[PDB]
Amino acid sequence: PNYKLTYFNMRGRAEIIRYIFAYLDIQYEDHRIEQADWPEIKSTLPFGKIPILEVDGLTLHQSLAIARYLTKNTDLAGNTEMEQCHVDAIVDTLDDFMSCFPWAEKKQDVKEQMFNELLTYNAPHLMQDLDTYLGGREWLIGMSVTWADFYWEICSTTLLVFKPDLLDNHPRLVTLRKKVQAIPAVANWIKRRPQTKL
Amino acid sequence: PNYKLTYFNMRGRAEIIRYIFAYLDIQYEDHRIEQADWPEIKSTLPFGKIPILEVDGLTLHQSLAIARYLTKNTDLAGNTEMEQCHVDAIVDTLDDFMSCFPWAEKKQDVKEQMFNELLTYNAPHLMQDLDTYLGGREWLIGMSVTWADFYWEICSTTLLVFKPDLLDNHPRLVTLRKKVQAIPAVANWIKRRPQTKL
Ligand SMILES: N[C@@H](CCC(=O)N[C@@H](CS)C(=O)NCC(=O)O)C(=O)O
Ligand SMILES: N[C@@H](CCC(=O)N[C@@H](CS)C(=O)NCC(=O)O)C(=O)O
Ligand SMILES: [Mg+2]
């Protein structure tokens, strides 16, 4: 089928979709719009938000809903229904935290303060719960990589931009990132993708 | 299987699970804890949040992950993988919005300010997007009820508590709420459930 992903020129919420396409070796149009075209693009979105993924003429929206759709019947989904639930749960827990940041906050002064408070007073609790959850296991769910691992690597990459020492107390979570970054197809995408801050 | 749902004494985030159980005619323990006992239970949870669902001893978390698990392979999921994606997307759009409200904000000043902002400016836009998405169809996705319809009913019920005129310009969205409440199993639950504000 023909796929067309539309998002801004940044990793952000479209990156999980881009990782999945890379991993599954599926061709797609990576459409990155500029701020100047937002007004026009927006008037075509079902709920005024991106990313959207057009599949053979039909529009899908919501990054995680799209990620789940693309991984259905693949090795990234989770081996059992219980495990698939755990994958969804970990992704939503991560997404819940990322959604707490004031990404659209105009006033930089207030924005910086909130980011710093979230990374100092809240992040540590989530990092510890994730580390405890993973224990000595190779991956977050099951005995093989799932898109939950992809999401951890993606979210942590952005958090590290604002809090470099985020994982200084959790080497096991760093190892996990490295294992994700070591997957051949993923490594290739990470090396070739457009370099953006977020 | 043996199901035990744990949450606070309110509809909130556990209600979608309660609707699914009622619709599917599944018995479960509806455990509603007291604030005074939350800090004790919280310490035993991998991620310290509720609702959680114990399935034959195994614990699951994240309301939507659990809802998806329960509806898999049932008539409440979409009829195709694409339709299943639409269901997931609608639920996430609604959840994203409801999650924007500062429910735990102690500062009545900031809390009231954000509630008014969300209800006065954002809500109308979402309502218009939803009405347009629904069009003249009976349900949000496909030709039959899905858990996305349940979620609309649940979400709008709480929104209507703070903004009763929410749907005065959207009769079709009111009718959808009524269509869901009319389903025998749901109507039975609605009339039997604990009467709470949220
Ligand atoms: N939870 C949604 C997020 C939707 C969202 O807020 N997208 C942002 C881009 S990162 C956007 O479209 N913003 C436009 C706006 O805020 O009006 C997803 O994962 O797709
Ligand atoms: N996004 C999670 C909700 C996590 C959450 O914030 N739950 C609230 C109850 S509505 C709770 O656990 N708050 C008590 C606390 O965080 O200590 C889900 O959908 O289950
Ligand atoms: Mg979410």
UniProtKB/Swiss-Prot annotation, chains A, B:
GO MF terms, alphabetically ordered: calcium ion binding; glutathione transferase activity; magnesium ion binding; prostaglandin-D synthase activity; protein homodimerization activity
Cofactor note: Glutathione is required for the prostaglandin D synthase activity.
Keyword Cytoplasm assigned: yes
GO BP annotations, alphabetical order: glutathione metabolic process; locomotory behavior; negative regulation of male germ cell proliferation; prostaglandin biosynthetic process; prostaglandin metabolic process; response to nematode; response to selenium ion; signal transduction
Distribution of this protein across tissues and organs: Expressed in a number of megakaryocytic cell lines but not in platelets. Highly expressed in adipose tissue, macrophages and placenta. Also expressed at lower levels in lung, heart, lymph nodes, appendix, bone marrow and fetal liver.
Subcellular location: Cytoplasm
Residue ranges annotated for the GST N-terminal domain, each copy included: 1-78
GO CC terms of this entry: cytoplasm; cytosol; intracellular membrane-bounded organelle; nucleoplasm
Assembly information from the UniProt record: Homodimer.
Protein name from the UniProt record: Hematopoietic prostaglandin D synthase
Catalytic activity: prostaglandin H2 = prostaglandin D2; RX + glutathione = an S-substituted glutathione + a halide anion + H(+); 2-glyceryl-prostaglandin H2 = 2-glyceryl-prostaglandin D2
UniProt keyword annotations, A-Z: Calcium, Cytoplasm, Fatty acid biosynthesis, Fatty acid metabolism, Isomerase, Lipid biosynthesis, Lipid metabolism, Magnesium, Metal-binding, Prostaglandin biosynthesis, Prostaglandin metabolism, Transferase
Annotated positions binding glutathione: 7, 13, 38, 48-50, 62-63
Activity regulation statement: Prostaglandin PGD2 synthesis is stimulated by calcium and magnesium ions. One calcium or magnesium ion is bound between the subunits of the homodimer. The interactions with the protein are for the most part mediated via water molecules. Magnesium increases the affinity for glutathione, while calcium has no effect on the affinity for glutathione.
Superkingdom, natural source: Eukaryota
Stated family: Belongs to the GST superfamily. Sigma family.
All residue ranges annotated as the GST C-terminal domain in the record: 80-198
Induction profile: By 12-O-tetradecanoylphorbol-13-acetate (TPA).
Cofactor: glutathione
One Pfam family matching this protein: GST_N
EC numbers: 5.3.99.2, 2.5.1.18
Role played: Bifunctional enzyme which catalyzes both the conversion of PGH2 to PGD2, a prostaglandin involved in smooth muscle contraction/relaxation and a potent inhibitor of platelet aggregation, and the conjugation of glutathione with a wide range of aryl halides and organic isothiocyanates. Also exhibits low glutathione-peroxidase activity towards cumene hydroperoxide.
